[PDB]
Design an enzyme around this catalytic site. Structure first.
Site, PDB file in Angstrom:
ATOM      1  N   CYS A 195       0.867  -1.195   0.000  1.00 35.19           N
ATOM      2  CA  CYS A 195       0.000   0.000   0.000  1.00 35.19           C
ATOM      3  C   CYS A 195       0.892   1.230   0.000  1.00 35.19           C
ATOM      4  O   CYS A 195       1.978   1.217   0.606  1.00 35.19           O
ATOM      5  CB  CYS A 195      -0.911  -0.061   1.231  1.00 35.19           C
ATOM      6  SG  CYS A 195      -1.964   1.406   1.540  1.00 35.19           S
TER       7      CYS A 195
ATOM      8  N   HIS B 115       0.699  -3.698   6.522  1.00 37.60           N
ATOM      9  CA  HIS B 115      -0.582  -3.674   7.233  1.00 37.60           C
ATOM     10  C   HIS B 115      -1.729  -4.283   6.422  1.00 37.60           C
ATOM     11  O   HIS B 115      -2.830  -4.376   7.003  1.00 37.60           O
ATOM     12  CB  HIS B 115      -0.911  -2.234   7.634  1.00 37.60           C
ATOM     13  CG  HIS B 115      -1.077  -1.319   6.457  1.00 37.60           C
ATOM     14  ND1 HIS B 115      -0.029  -0.833   5.697  1.00 37.60           N
ATOM     15  CD2 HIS B 115      -2.202  -0.836   5.869  1.00 37.60           C
ATOM     16  CE1 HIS B 115      -0.553  -0.092   4.722  1.00 37.60           C
ATOM     17  NE2 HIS B 115      -1.860  -0.069   4.778  1.00 37.60           N
TER      18      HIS B 115
ATOM     19  N   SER C 133       0.554   3.617   1.861  1.00 37.51           N
ATOM     20  CA  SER C 133       0.834   4.021   3.252  1.00 37.51           C
ATOM     21  C   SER C 133       2.099   3.349   3.778  1.00 37.51           C
ATOM     22  O   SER C 133       2.786   3.938   4.630  1.00 37.51           O
ATOM     23  CB  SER C 133      -0.269   3.743   4.186  1.00 37.51           C
ATOM     24  OG  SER C 133      -1.475   4.388   3.789  1.00 37.51           O
TER      25      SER C 133
ATOM     26  N   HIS D 167       4.737   5.520   2.733  1.00 34.35           N
ATOM     27  CA  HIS D 167       4.774   6.751   3.541  1.00 34.35           C
ATOM     28  C   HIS D 167       5.669   6.561   4.754  1.00 34.35           C
ATOM     29  O   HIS D 167       6.230   7.563   5.244  1.00 34.35           O
ATOM     30  CB  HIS D 167       3.362   7.150   4.002  1.00 34.35           C
ATOM     31  CG  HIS D 167       2.475   7.648   2.928  1.00 34.35           C
ATOM     32  ND1 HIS D 167       2.917   8.157   1.747  1.00 34.35           N
ATOM     33  CD2 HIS D 167       1.118   7.745   2.925  1.00 34.35           C
ATOM     34  CE1 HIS D 167       1.847   8.548   1.046  1.00 34.35           C
ATOM     35  NE2 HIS D 167       0.741   8.348   1.779  1.00 34.35           N
TER      36      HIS D 167
ATOM     37  N   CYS E 159      -6.899  -3.586   3.613  1.00 29.43           N
ATOM     38  CA  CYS E 159      -6.698  -2.139   3.538  1.00 29.43           C
ATOM     39  C   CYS E 159      -7.328  -1.572   2.273  1.00 29.43           C
ATOM     40  O   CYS E 159      -8.391  -0.907   2.367  1.00 29.43           O
ATOM     41  CB  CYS E 159      -5.252  -1.671   3.628  1.00 29.43           C
ATOM     42  SG  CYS E 159      -5.246   0.142   3.607  1.00 29.43           S
TER      43      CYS E 159
HETATM   44  N1  LIG Z   1      -7.758   6.600   4.877  1.00 31.39           N
HETATM   45  C1  LIG Z   1      -7.306   5.336   4.839  1.00 31.39           C
HETATM   46  O1  LIG Z   1      -7.778   4.471   5.630  1.00 31.39           O
HETATM   47  C2  LIG Z   1      -6.295   4.976   3.874  1.00 31.39           C
HETATM   48  C3  LIG Z   1      -6.174   3.590   3.505  1.00 31.39           C
HETATM   49  C4  LIG Z   1      -5.338   3.295   2.410  1.00 31.39           C
HETATM   50  C5  LIG Z   1      -4.567   4.256   1.787  1.00 31.39           C
HETATM   51  N2  LIG Z   1      -4.632   5.570   2.257  1.00 31.39           N
HETATM   52  C6  LIG Z   1      -3.958   6.641   1.545  1.00 31.39           C
HETATM   53  O2  LIG Z   1      -4.611   6.823   0.303  1.00 31.39           O
HETATM   54  C7  LIG Z   1      -3.664   7.331  -0.654  1.00 31.39           C
HETATM   55  C8  LIG Z   1      -3.741   6.506  -1.933  1.00 31.39           C
HETATM   56  O3  LIG Z   1      -3.182   5.209  -1.673  1.00 31.39           O
HETATM   57  P1  LIG Z   1      -2.935   4.247  -2.908  1.00 31.39           P
HETATM   58  O4  LIG Z   1      -4.125   4.199  -3.805  1.00 31.39           O
HETATM   59  O5  LIG Z   1      -2.352   3.005  -2.345  1.00 31.39           O
HETATM   60  O6  LIG Z   1      -1.787   5.096  -3.619  1.00 31.39           O
HETATM   61  P2  LIG Z   1      -1.178   5.169  -5.085  1.00 31.39           P
HETATM   62  O7  LIG Z   1      -1.292   3.841  -5.743  1.00 31.39           O
HETATM   63  O8  LIG Z   1       0.129   5.834  -4.947  1.00 31.39           O
HETATM   64  O9  LIG Z   1      -2.163   6.103  -5.874  1.00 31.39           O
HETATM   65  C9  LIG Z   1      -2.128   7.533  -5.807  1.00 31.39           C
HETATM   66  C10 LIG Z   1      -2.454   8.077  -7.178  1.00 31.39           C
HETATM   67  O10 LIG Z   1      -2.453   9.519  -7.077  1.00 31.39           O
HETATM   68  C11 LIG Z   1      -1.999  10.019  -8.310  1.00 31.39           C
HETATM   69  N3  LIG Z   1      -1.562  11.388  -8.128  1.00 31.39           N
HETATM   70  C12 LIG Z   1      -0.399  11.833  -7.555  1.00 31.39           C
HETATM   71  N4  LIG Z   1      -0.429  13.194  -7.547  1.00 31.39           N
HETATM   72  C13 LIG Z   1      -1.605  13.604  -8.126  1.00 31.39           C
HETATM   73  C14 LIG Z   1      -2.243  14.884  -8.477  1.00 31.39           C
HETATM   74  N5  LIG Z   1      -1.641  16.012  -8.170  1.00 31.39           N
HETATM   75  N6  LIG Z   1      -3.498  14.826  -9.008  1.00 31.39           N
HETATM   76  C15 LIG Z   1      -4.111  13.689  -9.289  1.00 31.39           C
HETATM   77  N7  LIG Z   1      -3.524  12.525  -9.097  1.00 31.39           N
HETATM   78  C16 LIG Z   1      -2.303  12.475  -8.493  1.00 31.39           C
HETATM   79  C17 LIG Z   1      -0.890   9.066  -8.702  1.00 31.39           C
HETATM   80  O11 LIG Z   1      -0.527   9.194 -10.068  1.00 31.39           O
HETATM   81  C18 LIG Z   1      -1.473   7.707  -8.293  1.00 31.39           C
HETATM   82  O12 LIG Z   1      -2.129   7.013  -9.363  1.00 31.39           O
HETATM   83  C19 LIG Z   1      -2.297   7.352   0.051  1.00 31.39           C
HETATM   84  O13 LIG Z   1      -2.051   8.634   0.659  1.00 31.39           O
HETATM   85  C20 LIG Z   1      -2.504   6.351   1.172  1.00 31.39           C
HETATM   86  O14 LIG Z   1      -1.629   6.551   2.249  1.00 31.39           O
HETATM   87  C21 LIG Z   1      -5.522   5.924   3.219  1.00 31.39           C
HETATM   88  O1  LIG Z   2      -3.196   2.658   4.523  1.00 32.20           O
HETATM   89  C1  LIG Z   2      -3.772   2.675   5.831  1.00 32.20           C
HETATM   90  C2  LIG Z   2      -3.181   3.800   6.677  1.00 32.20           C
HETATM   91  C3  LIG Z   2      -3.890   4.934   6.994  1.00 32.20           C
HETATM   92  F1  LIG Z   2      -5.175   5.050   6.629  1.00 32.20           F
HETATM   93  C4  LIG Z   2      -3.349   5.981   7.688  1.00 32.20           C
HETATM   94  F2  LIG Z   2      -4.067   7.062   7.989  1.00 32.20           F
HETATM   95  C5  LIG Z   2      -2.054   5.881   8.088  1.00 32.20           C
HETATM   96  F3  LIG Z   2      -1.505   6.881   8.785  1.00 32.20           F
HETATM   97  C6  LIG Z   2      -1.317   4.787   7.819  1.00 32.20           C
HETATM   98  F4  LIG Z   2      -0.032   4.646   8.254  1.00 32.20           F
HETATM   99  C7  LIG Z   2      -1.874   3.732   7.124  1.00 32.20           C
HETATM  100  F5  LIG Z   2      -1.166   2.626   6.903  1.00 32.20           F
HETATM  101 ZN   LIG Z   3      -3.139   0.983   3.532  1.00 32.46          ZN
END
Ligand SMILES: NC(=O)c1ccc[n+]([C@@H]2O[C@H](COP(=O)([O-])OP(=O)([O-])OC[C@H]3O[C@@H](n4cnc5c(N)[nH+]cnc54)[C@H](O)[C@@H]3O)[C@@H](O)[C@H]2O)c1
Ligand SMILES: OCc1c(F)c(F)c(F)c(F)c1F
Ligand SMILES: [Zn+2]
Ligand SMILES: NC(=O)c1ccc[n+]([C@@H]2O[C@H](COP(=O)([O-])OP(=O)([O-])OC[C@H]3O[C@@H](n4cnc5c(N)[nH+]cnc54)[C@H](O)[C@@H]3O)[C@@H](O)[C@H]2O)c1
Ligand SMILES: OCc1c(F)c(F)c(F)c(F)c1F
Ligand SMILES: [Zn+2]
Ligand SMILES: [Zn+2]
Ligand SMILES: [Zn+2]
EC number: 1.1.1.1
Lengths: 374, 374
Positions: B46, B67, B48, B51, B174
């Site tokens: 993921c 995770h 995250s 990150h 996730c």
């Molecule tokens: N809230 C939660 O529970 C939770 C759970 C899982 C992931 N996350 C977060 O969600 C986000 C996405 O995760 P993911 O899908 O695995 O990531 P990912 O696969 O990196 O996807 C992100 C996408 O954003 C695109 N992108 C980057 N910059 C821009 C821009 N300026 N405008 C439009 N598109 C852009 C990028 O090209 C990519 O396709 C990350 O920040 C994770 O940490 C949150």
């Molecule tokens: O991708 C799931 C996930 C989150 F939604 C968070 F907000 C975060 F801080 C993190 F570390 C994480 F793993």
């Molecule tokens: Zn995640």
């Protein structure tokens, strides 16, 4: 008869920001098609009118301000179907055109015909019905109630109960409905919940009324003016707190008092810092915070979006979320049926000629609502 | 038997930010009371997890990240009642203790026992089950799935269907659940609505899946990488837009495309600027915007609160708003009954030993989900 004629009457003209209203003769044109000319009976002093004076809210000047009022229809233009001469009415500072995508949406009320977003200070047709000393004078939010007569578009007026006491129900035109709806409709306060209300003026007191009507178990009023606390308790606050009394930030105090954060918080002041405080003090996973206060022109707040990612909901609303023309008559009918009280909001009743004295009472912290009578 | 004994196994240890993982031997202590030791079978990469490497999400180092995973219980500590050795399980990065005020709330899921808000990088008892080179190693979100064996608290594991394909259903831990729930549960997307999804990675694709399942009429995908558009359309996007193609800001483009603003928008990237853009592009009176992306540590956004005062709702959520232990088994059952698909998210498969190549694929933009097999 006045119908079809220019009326010369008294109004409170605001020629420039940060000056007293000028109480003087204006000319009020007759209503055009789909317009309504109203003889005003009572108008409230809302903090939003003071925002025009202070430059907090920008609208074209010179202006006839005033948006919280009630009066009696003097005449109607061609094509009006919803009011008649002699009807009691409340002008609607948020219109209800019934046609736009917002009016058609079950949860929208900020009709696209509003003059709040990009204020023009005119009738819907882009012109003014007011002259003073030979100069055109702007309208305010399609209402302009600081005048013995005004002209409004039909979508900006609601007919109300003929037996209405206009010196009370004018508050349904802004402050009561805004606060009460913010609690019952926008936040949807739940039975048994804990609420925090920032700002205990007329609108914050109406939020408390709505939280109590919704069955909140705890309603914590927050104000820097402890003179506001007794009336807040009278209308339902269970505790009051003054941020100035504490060494910690009040969001920490409220989180502690609520054993981990409140269910519902309301910002009813108009300060960026209290908007962020109010969001922070609601429980991080399921709390809801509603912005009611009008923020200062062109100023951004700063906040950490982790406050939202944990699960908080942040929203705002105009006029309590009420669809204005559907809701105002029903709110008046509910008042007539003793479903809520308005007297707790009214601290002063002055003749219209004392408008400036009424604004001084608000600015000094001494009033909740002053009602001006024509 | 390994029950009650230290297990020596391989794990991917992160000693330092902005460095490759080190695949090397670790010692995994046996589970204490109310702990569960899991033999991992599959784990996803993921954003995250990345990150943690980039210092976007701060957690103590050195650490075993991971995770999003599935495995088989190797042993249970004293007093465990909800899983048994041999059960298939998904670790829960958001726990469900069942006892705290959030767990008891009908709409909360961010259990107060989480290690996300203020990360310690430990078990619930404040200690670590991992040693490497004789040094204690941090846990991550109570899961630490980048290891052949992990130990989790019982409130951080769910039993799933014994016939589950673990190399698929790990995504329910996730990315799938987060995106799908963000649409169906948090936003509550309505039939016939217009949605905008910012970010078309695994989580944004799962948001699209949820918007389509909810019956949205239009689903506009937004990504600066046009290679993401084909898969977005396969899972339900009706249009895709690249902000880089336009002279105007994309909030203005999306407002124009939606004839005045979208019903629902989703930030699924993790940028402050796109959080504000996504809010702005939802309709000003009734729009809803959901933050899903994780923002950079300790950084604040700037926004104009008039965006909320008109009527917008802004919210965020962890794990799609799902109560984790209740929901994960039901999501697996629904997957087994073909109620949603996971294969569209899986673009690459690698052995666990090639974890760094899996992160290279994510960082290049080439992958959606890489699944690692132990
Ligand atoms: N809230 C939660 O529970 C939770 C759970 C899982 C992931 N996350 C977060 O969600 C986000 C996405 O995760 P993911 O899908 O695995 O990531 P990912 O696969 O990196 O996807 C992100 C996408 O954003 C695109 N992108 C980057 N910059 C821009 C821009 N300026 N405008 C439009 N598109 C852009 C990028 O090209 C990519 O396709 C990350 O920040 C994770 O940490 C949150
Ligand atoms: O991708 C799931 C996930 C989150 F939604 C968070 F907000 C975060 F801080 C993190 F570390 C994480 F793993
Ligand atoms: Zn995640
Ligand atoms: N959203 C709407 O439709 C709508 C309608 C009506 C009023 N408003 C706004 O709502 C706000 C309240 O209006 P009102 O009740 O007429 O105003 P008001 O009577 O001036 O009340 C404001 C209260 O805030 C208190 N206060 C000032 N600073 C602080 C502080 N730092 N902490 C706590 N309390 C503080 C102050 O003492 C006073 O009692 C104003 O910004 C209005 O413009 C919005
Ligand atoms: O008090 C009602 C009211 C508002 F809610 C505003 F947002 C505003 F700008 C304004 F001028 C006003 F009068
Ligand atoms: Zn309308
Ligand atoms: Zn007002
Ligand atoms: Zn809990």
């Amino acid at each position: 008869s006045t119908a079809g004629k220019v009326i010369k009457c008294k109004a409170a003209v605001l020629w420039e920001e940060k000056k007293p209203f000028s109480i003087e003769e204006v000319e009020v044109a007759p209503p055009k098609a789909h317009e309504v000319r109203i003889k005003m009976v009572a108008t409230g002093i809302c903090r939003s009118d003071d925002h025009v004076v202070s430059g907090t809210f920008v609208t074209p000047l010179p202006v006839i301000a005033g948006h919280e009022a009630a009066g009696i229809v003097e005449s109607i233009g061609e094509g009006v179907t919803t009011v008649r001469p002699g009807d009691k009415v409340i002008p609607l500072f948020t219109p209800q055109c019934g046609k736009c995508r917002v009016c058609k949406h079950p949860e929208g009320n900020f009709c696209l015909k509003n003059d709040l977003s990009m204020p023009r200070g005119t009738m819907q047709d882009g012109t003014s019905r007011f002259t003073c000393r030979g100069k055109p004078i702007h309208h305010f939010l399609g209402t302009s109630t600081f005048s013995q007569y005004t002209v409004v578009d039909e979508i900006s007026v609601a007919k109300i109960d003929a037996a209405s006491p206009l010196e009370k129900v004018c508050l349904i035109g802004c402050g009561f409905s805004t606060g009460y709806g913010s609690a019952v409709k926008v936040a949807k306060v739940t039975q048994g919940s804990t609420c925090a209300v920032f700002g205990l003026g007329g609108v914050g007191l109406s939020v408390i009324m709505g939280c109590k009507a919704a069955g909140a178990a705890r309603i914590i009023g927050v104000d820097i003016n402890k003179d506001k606390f007794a009336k807040a308790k009278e209308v339902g606050a269970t505790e009051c707190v003054n941020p100035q009394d504490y060494k910690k930030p009040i969001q920490e105090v409220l989180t502690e008092m609520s054993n981990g954060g409140v269910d519902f918080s309301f910002e009813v002041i108009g300060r960026l810092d209290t908007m962020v405080t109010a969001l922070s003090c609601c429980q991080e996973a399921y709390g809801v915070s509603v912005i009611v206060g009008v923020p200062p022109d062109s100023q951004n707040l700063s906040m950490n979006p982790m406050l939202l990612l944990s699960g908080r909901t942040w929203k705002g609303a105009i006029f309590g979320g009420f669809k204005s023309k559907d809701s105002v008559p029903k709110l008046v009918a509910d008042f007539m049926a003793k479903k809520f009280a308005l007297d707790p909001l009214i601290t002063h009743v002055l003749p219209f000629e004392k408008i400036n004295e009424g604004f001084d009472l608000l600015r000094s912290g001494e009033s909740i609502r002053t009602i001006l009578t024509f």
